[PDB]
Symmetry: D2
Subunit: 246 residues, 4 copies
Amino acid sequence: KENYYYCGENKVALVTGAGRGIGREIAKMLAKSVSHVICISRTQKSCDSVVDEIKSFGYESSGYAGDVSKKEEISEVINKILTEHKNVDILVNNAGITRDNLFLRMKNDEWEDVLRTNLNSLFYITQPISKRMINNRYGRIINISSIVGLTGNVGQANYSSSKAGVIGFTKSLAKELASRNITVNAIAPGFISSISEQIKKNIISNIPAGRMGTPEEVANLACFLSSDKSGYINGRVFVIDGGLSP
Amino acid sequence: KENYYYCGENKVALVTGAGRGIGREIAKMLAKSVSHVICISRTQKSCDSVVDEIKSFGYESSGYAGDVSKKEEISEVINKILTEHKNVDILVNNAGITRDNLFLRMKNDEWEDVLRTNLNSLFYITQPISKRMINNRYGRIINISSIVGLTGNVGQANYSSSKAGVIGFTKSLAKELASRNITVNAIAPGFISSISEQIKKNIISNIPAGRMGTPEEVANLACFLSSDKSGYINGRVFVIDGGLSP
Amino acid sequence: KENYYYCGENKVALVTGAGRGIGREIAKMLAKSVSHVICISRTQKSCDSVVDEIKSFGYESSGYAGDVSKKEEISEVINKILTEHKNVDILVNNAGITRDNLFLRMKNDEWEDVLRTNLNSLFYITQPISKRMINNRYGRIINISSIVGLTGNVGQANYSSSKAGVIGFTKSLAKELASRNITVNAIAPGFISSISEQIKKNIISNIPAGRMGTPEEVANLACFLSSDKSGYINGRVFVIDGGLSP
Amino acid sequence: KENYYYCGENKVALVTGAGRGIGREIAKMLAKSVSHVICISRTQKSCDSVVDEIKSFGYESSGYAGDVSKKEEISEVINKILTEHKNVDILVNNAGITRDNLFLRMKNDEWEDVLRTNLNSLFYITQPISKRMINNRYGRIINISSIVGLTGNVGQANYSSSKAGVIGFTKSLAKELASRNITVNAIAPGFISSISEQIKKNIISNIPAGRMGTPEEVANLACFLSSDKSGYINGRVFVIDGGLSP
């Protein structure tokens, strides 16, 4: 009673921020149909946890600790992965953080850390991988953005700027890489489970669906985009938010 | 080597404009996972053809002739379908036409027929069906629009107006029906196969993917939206255009 | 202490639905800088009222009764206007109605009347006028849509469909007419003054600006778009909503 | 034969990247209706040039050299400006650069410099100024983005990411500052004059208007947004591109 996503043969996927939530469910679901799923988490403990969960189901997976906010460090991790794997066919850029505050109160580090972690990081991770995808003439790049990147949100000028940036990145790369059978798309989740009970009720009262979404629902959308039959979807932003913001 | 879309148990789908192209592929693909697929085409000959194709594969299907541009006629067809079927869980509003012309030359009937067929029709088909979905607390409504409904197009002021209207319809209904476990979304295809060879080459030269899409690709997206695991996607427009217009 | 909009020399403007609200303020403000403002209202009494108001300030204005929902009637009114005036340089398509109801309860006439009045009418009014603009190589067409045409709204599936359609019309015509120095743009107002006090407070509580907009504010935007210096703005939708829906 | 933009009484405007092009025309046009226009350019020579041009017309203007890509330096410049001026009522964030390259060839510094200059800079410039606007309960913040921030562009993954980020920033701040009578909007220019003649012809052939826009046209839009009567326009992106991308 679940969908099956055929992603092609002998494929390797790489998911950043795979230690928890959406990233973790994406890595676990991709494992059902790709030959090997690489998990990157800030700490080795975090990725080992998800890699173990994936392996316990009989699938192949490996994990590398990597802090995407540190360009030299993450660049080395990706280089290492590419020496071990000739190709990385599916890349899910999910790593990201929030450092919320009204703009008037926001600290310079809250602004910088969110932009650096959520946006600047895409270059260091995606460039080496895209080079291999171009050479192999195949790829699926899925960038996790947020509905806040489309609408803005009180207390999140930094997060919104970063996630809107993810969308501009996505569209430009789609234009450049599509001729090589590479699709580049973004997923913009709304309120996904995993805040005071009163604020949560306030939020849910604004969602037509009447509930928050689940990380498994987001993973379904990411695996659909990673599949073989989604090759004509390119440069788009797919919002999964229960009707919060049509 | 294909995706499998679990759409739930004992489901009935209805696809309009099912006689050819996108509509036909959507009806055929839905048949792989729904209990019964109802096909509506302008002529009984057209729907019998697709119903026969679906049945030849061992699936259940029935067909009703119905001209969506004639409100009294299509309203009766839908009423008949609902007397025979208690529920229609998935509705794909695909029927539509084009009557191209530069605005300066466009005839009043070219304007009227396209709006009436492509937009006014949605009310007569969707209202009775949505009443059953609300009572049953379940539904998937997929409206086929077009990238032209988002960007406009020379020679298609009528088509663009109609397809943009489909999107406004989609978003309003998503807001009203989501609490009853009904999702309402639109698919906006770009250039899908099925024009002079020179104009076709001109078009393809504007598509990053370097080719037109196939009706089977559009059907994959419609079946994904019809699936059980896409219940949190609501009120959205999903563009499938090979990167033509990010 | 007000803006001045230079709209060119010897210009004639035509505003539909000029009898009240936004339409009335647009006609009055355009009068400050165009040579003649033609007002169309459903009844002769309504347009005479605004024409008198405009004339009382020393400006030139004339009025024609015309029901935009009746194609034969409005087509004759426009033909008459064009026999009296060689050119109509600025056209503001503002006429429109609402017939609100949840989709489940909506009557066929509520659906039809709103689409016919708000969308089908654009063809009969704009086509003859655009022919003169093309011949004269100059024009400003401003179509009033609504934020509901962009986001959808509970109880307004008909209005939203119609106003989204206005946007598709706008973009297609912009593509076709821009080479003739004609701009075609839409204005999408949010909540504009002119509902229970409790629902109004509920609405205002959702507007960052903390108040409804005024018809004079919408008129300022329409006159800016009608001005000489806005010739490079084309095929766009300008939302004036106090931040209600970024 | 020009528009007049009433921007209120005793207002002070600040324009970054005021040394040439769009920024220069915005500063010059604002000077016609604000009491004092502050110009910031990377070099003191550049801003002195525009300040002299503005003063030669009888208006008040001052200039400060400031490199927006250097956070400590630009933060000090803004602090200095705010010690000299109690209020800065209008802020036009126009400073920005391009460092074009296909993603595969792009250098890490080309990615970093564009994001740092075009996006990270907004925090250091806008935060101190917004604090004064909140205290004074009045403001106009206009952020210059680009159509590339909406559509992406081959060879500009860095620029597109930065300019899309500007839009996310704009929408979040609009939500936070609107209650204090502060509007925050973005302008997304298309191809503005000031490339091989063949590529330029190729570009112009894609613009319905059949020409590039002028910096004076962009300035008109910025001054309209800075005016008193545009207080209900908030959190929007206004595209000025001759119909290039509806």
